């Protein structure tokens, strides 16, 4: 594998270069929206984002070494966690608001249910801000989610390779923190702080997946074929 031979700095460069673009929504402040339309904006946006995520995943060192069957599984497991962490990252510098798109910033006051999830996403964003989370750290965290979220629900040699890459990413994170002037105690503490946030991201994803199932069955808010398929995987 080539992933195993990367230096920390090379790992970081590779991840940064692989970042997907920030997409726009179809929000129009002059147009009336309903709970349904406002949601259609989020689902339409998520659908277009997925295509970029899939292509992003292939550039995550280690990912393409896996069988197509396993790549599919990892993305089905992690897609909402990944959308969500990206959203929280985009929202860091916008206290009290979620920046779904440069032209779509929503506050808590914006839907029926979902406010609970919004609130959690806001807390996570505030958390990143307080920690002064760095972009280099963010892209590591996002790759960890991709590889880790489905790893325990699949040769299980494939699993070993994933664990090795995962260890490499930990090495990279520590490397970044050392280079930032953190003491060893500080590095370990910050590493843990970052990784515990992933539990919260998992929680938000799980709760969102349930909310999305209701929306589907309600059959009012539009959902692309790919999104329906990604949802089915969790059910």
């Amino acid at each position: 594998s080539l992933a195993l031979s990367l230096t920390a700095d090379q790992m970081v460069s590779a991840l940064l270069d692989a970042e997907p673009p920030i997409l726009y929504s179809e929000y129009d402040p002059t147009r009336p929206f309903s709970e349904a339309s406002m949601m259609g904006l989020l689902t339409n946006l998520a659908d277009r984002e997925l295509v970029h995520m899939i292509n992003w995943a292939k550039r995550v060192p280690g990912f393409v070494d896996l069988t197509l069957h396993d790549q599919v599984h990892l993305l089905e497991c992690a897609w909402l966690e990944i959308l969500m962490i990206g959203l929280v990252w985009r929202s860091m510098e916008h206290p009290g608001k979620l920046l779904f798109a440069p032209n779509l910033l929503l506050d808590r006051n914006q839907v029926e249910g979902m406010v609970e999830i919004f609130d959690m996403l806001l807390a996570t964003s505030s958390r990143f801000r307080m920690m002064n989370l760095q972009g280099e750290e963010f892209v590591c965290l996002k790759s960890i989610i991709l590889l880790n979220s489905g790893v325990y629900t699949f040769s299980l040699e494939e699993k070993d390779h994933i664990h090795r890459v995962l260890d490499k990413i930990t090495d990279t994170l520590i490397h970044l923190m050392a280079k930032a002037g953190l003491t060893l105690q500080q590095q370990h503490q910050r590493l843990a702080q970052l990784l515990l946030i992933l539990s919260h991201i998992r929680h938000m994803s799980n709760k969102g997946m349930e909310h999305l199932y209701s929306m589907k069955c309600k059959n009012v808010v539009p959902l692309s074929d790919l999104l329906l398929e990604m949802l089915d995987a969790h059910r």
């Binding site: 295509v51 599919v72 993305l75 790919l226 398929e229 990604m230």
Partner: peptide, 9 residues
């Protein structure tokens, strides 16, 4: 599967 298709070219 769409995701499977997109993953392979």
């Amino acid at each position: 599967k769409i995701l499977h298709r997109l993953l392979q070219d």
